Amino acid sequence: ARYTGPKSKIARKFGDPIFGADKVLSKKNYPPGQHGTSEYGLQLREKQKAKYTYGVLEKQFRHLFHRAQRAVTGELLIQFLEARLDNVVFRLGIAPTRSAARQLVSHRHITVDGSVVNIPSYSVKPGQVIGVRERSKSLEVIADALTGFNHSKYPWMEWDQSSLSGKLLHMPDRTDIPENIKEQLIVELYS
Amino acid sequence: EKRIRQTNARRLHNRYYARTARNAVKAFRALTDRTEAEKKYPVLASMLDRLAGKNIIHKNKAANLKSKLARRINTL
Amino acid sequence: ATKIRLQRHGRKGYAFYKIVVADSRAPRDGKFIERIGSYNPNTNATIDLNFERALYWIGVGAQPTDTARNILSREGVLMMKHLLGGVKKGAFDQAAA
Amino acid sequence: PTIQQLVRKGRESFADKSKSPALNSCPQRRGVCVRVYTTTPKPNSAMRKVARVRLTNSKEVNAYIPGEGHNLQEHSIVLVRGGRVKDLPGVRYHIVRGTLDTAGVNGRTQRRSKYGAKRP
RNA sequence: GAGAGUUUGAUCCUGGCUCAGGAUGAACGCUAGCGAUAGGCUUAACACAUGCAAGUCGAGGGGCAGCGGCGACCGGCGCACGGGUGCGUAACGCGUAUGCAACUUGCCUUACAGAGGGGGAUAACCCGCGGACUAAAACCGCAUACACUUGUAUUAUUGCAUGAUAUUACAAGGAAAUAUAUAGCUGUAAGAUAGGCAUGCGUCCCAUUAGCUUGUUGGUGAGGUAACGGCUCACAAGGCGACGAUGGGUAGGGGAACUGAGAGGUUUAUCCCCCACACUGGUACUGAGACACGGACCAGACUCCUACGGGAGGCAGCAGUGAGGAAUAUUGGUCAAUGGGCGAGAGCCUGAACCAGCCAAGUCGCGUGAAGGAAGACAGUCUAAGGAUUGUAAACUUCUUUUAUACGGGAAUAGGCGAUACGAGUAUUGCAUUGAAUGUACCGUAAGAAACAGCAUCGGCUAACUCCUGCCAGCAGCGAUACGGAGGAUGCGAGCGUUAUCCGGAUUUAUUGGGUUUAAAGGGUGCGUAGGUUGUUCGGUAAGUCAGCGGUGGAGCGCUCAACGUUCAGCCUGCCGUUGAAACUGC
Ligand SMILES: [K+]
Ligand SMILES: [K+]
Ligand SMILES: [K+]
Ligand SMILES: [Mg+2]
Ligand SMILES: [Mg+2]
Ligand SMILES: [Mg+2]
């Protein structure tokens, strides 16, 4: 399933702008509810923060966690979360937000190594090419997010605008990923 | 019905020759004269070997019976 | 009799066969005497085969099925005609073609 | 004990008893309401509705009726599950609401699946 | 490789109990979109009706009444497999490892020899359950085989006791299938395959189960068996037991699977190997092989039909139905693939098997939209403010998915030309139940798609109204930041909870790894049998112990991803055989 609910409530609950920029981040910024903590509370807040910022449900999150444990566990769990089709598409800037990237991947618009992959949880190994569909290179929504913005602030993406593709050089280290997540709390909770 | 008829006919056929051979060995087992035993042995051995190669009885059974009768006639 | 046959060891919609030597009375996916290879008809068909053991069993007299006979016709297992010393002593090389 | 004592005698392990022995290792059983009566709790002072039911496994037990408002009566076929009441000696089983003769609680809008009430 | 609560006015121990976790061929309540891949009477070896499930050969024979081929009969092969069930069985039944110099083995392969001569019935057919003639690859002699069996030897060689393997001889005896080059037939041997018997070790409780056995233990002889043997039949007396005989109760046994750091443990749901069985018993018969699963005979239930003289079935094969139960599905399609049986082949058959249908349904994956839009109306809590809330409403795009259309793979591979005259290697031919099924493509649309539990502590989540009994609970308990509703919140999410069962925390059986003054726990005290333990030292041995050598039993690839399939690196660390070592235990 998917959350498909109100996003500003989660944004005001967690304080951080996980989904992006909004006026409610500065106006009326407090946890939701007309009525609005133990270490269990903070650990649950951290785990739910990761889940909401990456669009992952509980069973998939647990599978990711113990896969990272089998193969610092909290350190590489974050890069496992980052290495996802929707997340990589969003970080390449070709889609505005992670939900938009997930919808674009789920629809027939994104190819991996020349073959269209529409599973928005496909792990992307290093040295792989992710590109827009050749039949969808001329969409009105597909171009304003990539062209014009042109952030390119991540030293593990190669963009190559002349082909509309993209490549992942290697898994970034835990310090270079701009996510305010304490993996020690999550690994302690799941331990 | 065909299986029943075949089994009955074959049972009667096997019983005929098996009983004949058994009676032959029983009659031979009461012999006393050495020359009579010598001149009665070959036909009985032939009948037993025919039964064994004819699958009414077993080859080892025929060999055992022939060995017993030969060892008997070797001692009068 | 002893046979050379294929057991369906795979998944629904993806048939993967194991080439074994087994009695004719045994079940299809049950007991076998020796495993001699694999077979996959889904590709464009990858065949694994123990040449020496297949030759030994076809020499002692295991009867192969039709598909296993075709698999042995491929990979040149039925070269027993050439290896029977048919008024010669050398070994020909037809594998290159 | 000594090693030889353990070799001669060994260790004996008991078996834990089942908290619902009348179910005969079944999740639910079927019974008929032999009697429907009311009992008093062992510092509560309430009037708890209970039914004596003879189960199909040749056993008679007492089953509590949860909720407010029961349409059951004598000689009613009911479904009996495990679960005991702390402040009531005796009874150790519950009656499933909304199954067989037992009806769901009317006017329920919360905890509906525990009392067999459909969505309004 | 971890914990929490709970005995008190308050402590520190001991000890049980209860929660928290993980897993179900589970059931129930509420609510349900799709795809893939698993699974599906756990209750009784319960009853029913119908159909199918084992046939094939006209290159075996007599016939054609049927247009070429075949109804039926005689004959060959198969039906002992595949499939189903766990009653019975503490047993060489099973697991592991061996032995048979005490064994058998159709079909298959290879090697060596041979297929020569004859005669009776009899089915069907015909004529009325009776009468007569018919053919063989049906049946049975005769000829031959010294490769086989039996008996007597000689020459040996060599073992593990009874002996075994070969030669060189004499004697007796034992086979066949021919048909239209192919398909074949017989004897012998080797191989392969499958069975049989016997062994070492392991294999549940009860001593409120202490003696058991009289072919029982052994010897001689005989018979019988594929084969040794009290297996059976005509002296000595024994054998087995506190290392548990005997008797009673309960189980099919293993690998798996689940689950514990380990020690291990639980259970055989799917899968594989072995065993037992086919309404209940007894006997066999036919066969290479029988507990004979769609074969007999007899004796017992039970059930059904006659037309009262007589006959049928066993639903532990696959599917309907009824009952039992908390609970588990179609009287479906095809032999296209794999595997079987028969056939020279073509081919025929296959409820095995491939598939499909049904079932919250175990697991995995996806969707129910994506980016902006200020603080509408309607709910709450305070006459304004705060929560719902960027939430709705419009305005801009996208189609995974649903629908309508088209293209539509893969699963399907199997006449000459060397020539050894036949193998074998090369062309061609049809062949898909699934099936509009994957996949690909085309319009016009957010359009068709979210529940359940709990929010006073343990624990994540709080205002107002009811009640003040009705009620709720896993515990501290409340009867309300605990009951019922309304608003918000927090989990999870096509699921969420309740019940039932099993493991870990539990060290709550403690070898690893607990205790006995007062919490449970030293016998009233001795003597002593079996058993357990053994000061110091010098040598032998090799039972325990140690070592070596043999035999046996994570990285990829494909699923668009994943569950899942599949391959190799990697344990075999259990058992057995064979060589060595001598510090310690034993002798
Ligand atoms: K192919
Ligand atoms: K036979
Ligand atoms: K077939
Ligand atoms: Mg799911
Ligand atoms: Mg005391
Ligand atoms: Mg004392």
Q: What is the DSSP string of C36-55?
A: EEEEESS---EEEE-HHHHH
Compute, in angstroms, the gap from residue C59 CA to the centroid of ligand 2. Answer: 27
Contact A10, A18 (CB under 8 A): yes
Distances (CA, A) of C14 to A170, C38, C43, C51: 35, 14, 10, 26
Buried b (16+ CB within 10 A) or exposed e, A3-24: eeeebeebbbbbeeebbeeeee
Element spanning B65, H or E: helix B59-73
Secondary structure class of A162 (helix, strand, coil): coil
Token pair listed for A15: 């304080």
Question: Can you tell me the distance from the alpha carbon of A185 to that of A162, in angstroms, rounded to the nearest whole number?
Answer: 43
Distances (CA, A) of A54 to A121, A178, C37: 10, 13, 46
Closest listed ligand to the CA of C65: 3
Question: What's the maximum distance between 2 C-alpha atoms anywhere in chain C?
Answer: 50
Contact D93, D83 (CB under 8 A): yes
Token pair listed for A58: 């509980």
Checking DSSP bridges between strand C2-8 and strand C63-64, what pairing results, if any? Answer: parallel
Experimental technique for the deposited model: cryo-EM
Q: Which nucleotide is nearest to C82 (CA to C1')?
A: E424
List chains touching B (3+ CB pairs under 8 A). Answer: none
Closest listed ligand to the CA of C44: 1
**Resolution for this model in angstroms, one decimal place?**
3.0
As beta bridge partners, residue C49 has C37
CA neighbours within 13 Å on the CB side: how many for B61? 15
Checking DSSP bridges between strand D59-64 and strand D48-55, what pairing results, if any? Answer: antiparallel
Of A77, A30, A37, the residue nearest A56 (C-alpha): A77
Distances (CA, A) of C1 to A114, C24, C63, C64: 52, 5, 7, 10
Token pair listed for A99: 């939900």
Secondary structure class of B76 (helix, strand, coil): coil
Give me the residue label for tokens 């005497």. C33
Q: How far is the CA of C58 from the C1' of E346 (A)?
A: 26
Question: Can you tell me the distance from the alpha carbon of A185 to that of A188, in angstroms, rounded to the nearest whole number?
Answer: 5
Distances (CA, A) of C95 to A175, C56, C70, C73, D31: 58, 19, 16, 12, 78
Q: How far is the CA of C25 from the C1' of E295 (A)?
A: 22
Contact C13, C73 (CB under 8 A): no
Of D58, D65, D72, D76, the residue nearest D115 (C-alpha): D65
Compute, in angstroms, the gap from residue D15 CA to the centroid of ligand 5. Answer: 26
Question: Can you tell me the distance from the alpha carbon of A176 to that of A155, in angstroms, rounded to the nearest whole number?
Answer: 9
Question: Can you tell me the distance from the alpha carbon of D28 to that of D33, in angstroms, rounded to the nearest whole number?
Answer: 15
Contact D115, D107 (CB under 8 A): no
Q: How far is the CA of A9 from the C1' of E365 (A)?
A: 29
Distances (CA, A) of C64 to A124, C72, C81: 46, 9, 16
